[PDB]
Design a protein around this ligand. Structure first.
Ligand code: FMN
Ligand code: 3XS
Ligand code: ORO
Length: 364
């Protein structure tokens, strides 16, 4: 469980042998088998957060896209994440884009991916989650909630019906659902972020959700891009408040390529994640928090690899944070590292707990 060993030796050597997709698949295998150090870090009460109708024993989650098909959920809690998001899941199975479709930018601590929603489909994931449904109910009660991220098939004619199907099938198995309208890798998907289409889409989603039995009724969150115009952001905030959307996930990967990227593969098509996304994401959180008057829970994600990164997002308005790319460079010890550093920084800055820090920047 040594950060230095994983960061300086183990992870780099494994990356030396395996292309990123092979490495991802192997990581999922290892994780599902529990082949990792069980956490040194025991979660402090300071790290607990209550939001989305749930207790989270720590605010650090695993972002969607690592466990796309719900295969490694328990290994992910063992890794120390306070909550787990699986997906994106599409209604029907689909292969996603041709390989290669994932690229490392080691010099930038960044990744570019164009998976294209490769997915086992709703039915397979439903059965997988059903097999451990009662274990999840206890985990959730214990402060370890589960989120399910919903996508749409490449060849679907009715985007809203794809999401509605997802709500009906995986909604009853989830503590929260994510409407992913921000994947850069599915044609036309991000235009679902525009006002009229979003309102129509989310109205249908919320109706389907409200039609589920009470104990099986998840919160609904919208995951947005970091590449939105100011107009897009205003409109989303407006729709979210008009419809009573439960929360936002901020943000997905960027189609931008910030100046300064050094990686040889920087011009590959796809969404960029990791360090170059970090502050762009933090700023989007800051803006969405203000537009929603601090009343809509935000899960902050984008380039988090340290306690400081996490705290900056929390102070900007995030109630919870996720990471993914940092894990691909630092390995499993990064989770305890982030939690440990976050706790220390909360103390240094005079916060009683994570909850006190949420949106602190806006009250300065
Ligand atoms: C390889 C890869 C696959 C991803 N797949 C999904 C996905 O299926 N659905 C989704 O909402 N986000 C997906 N993401 C985005 C992450 O959830 C997250 O929003 C983004 O990577 C920023 O966080 P990070 O910098 O910590 O990696 C993916 C990211 C990566 C790198
Ligand atoms: C070292 O032993 C373990 C044990 C459990 C998980 C892991 C683990 C978690 S993530 C990971 N590597 N991930 C690599 C990866 C994932 C998605 C996309 C790209 C990459 C990559 O660039 O290698 N490995 C490693
Ligand atoms: O499947 C994808 O390629 C994918 C989806 C998503 O939401 N974000 C991302 O970076 N890639």
């Amino acid at each position: 469980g040594d950060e230095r060993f994983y960061a300086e030796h183990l992870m780099p050597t494994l990356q030396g042998l395996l292309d990123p997709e092979s490495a991802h698949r192997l990581a999922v295998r290892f994780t599902s088998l529990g082949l990792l150090p069980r956490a040194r870090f025991q979660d402090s009460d300071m790290l607990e957060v209550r939001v989305l109708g749930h207790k989270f024993r720590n605010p650090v989650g695993i972002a969607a896209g690592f466990d796309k098909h719900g295969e490694a959920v328990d290994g992910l809690y063992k890794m120390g994440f306070g909550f787990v998001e699986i997906g994106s899941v599409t209604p029907k199975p689909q292969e996603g884009n041709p390989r290669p479709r994932v690229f490392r930018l080691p010099e930038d601590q960044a990744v570019i991916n164009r998976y294209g929603f490769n997915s086992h489909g709703l039915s397979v994931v439903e059965h997988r989650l059903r097999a451990r449904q009662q274990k999840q109910a206890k985990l959730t009660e214990d402060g370890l909630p589960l989120g399910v991220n919903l996508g749409k098939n490449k060849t679907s004619v009715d985007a809203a019906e794809d999401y509605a199907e997802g709500v009906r099938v995986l909604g009853p198995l989830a503590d929260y659902l994510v409407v992913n309208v921000s994947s850069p890798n599915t044609a036309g998907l991000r235009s679902l972020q525009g006002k009229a289409e979003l309102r129509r889409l989310l109205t249908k989603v919320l109706q389907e959700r409200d039609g589920l039995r009470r104990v099986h009724r998840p919160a609904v969150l919208v995951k947005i891009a970091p590449d939105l115009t100011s107009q897009d952001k205003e409109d989303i905030a407006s729709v979210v408040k008009e419809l009573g959307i439960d929360g936002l996930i901020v943000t997905n990967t960027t189609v931008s390529r910030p100046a300064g990227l050094q990686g040889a593969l920087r011009s590959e098509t796809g969404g960029l994640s990791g360090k170059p996304l970090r502050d762009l994401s933090t700023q989007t959180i800051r803006e969405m928090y203000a537009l929603t008057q601090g009343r809509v829970p935000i899960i902050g994600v984008g380039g988090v690899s340290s306690g400081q990164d996490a705290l900056e997002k929390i102070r900007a308005g995030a109630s919870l944070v996720q990471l993914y790319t940092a894990l691909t460079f630092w390995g499993p010890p990064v989770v305890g590292k982030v939690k440990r550093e976050l706790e220390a920084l909360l103390k240094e800055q005079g916060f009683g707990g994570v909850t006190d820090a949420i949106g602190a920047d806006h009250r300065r």
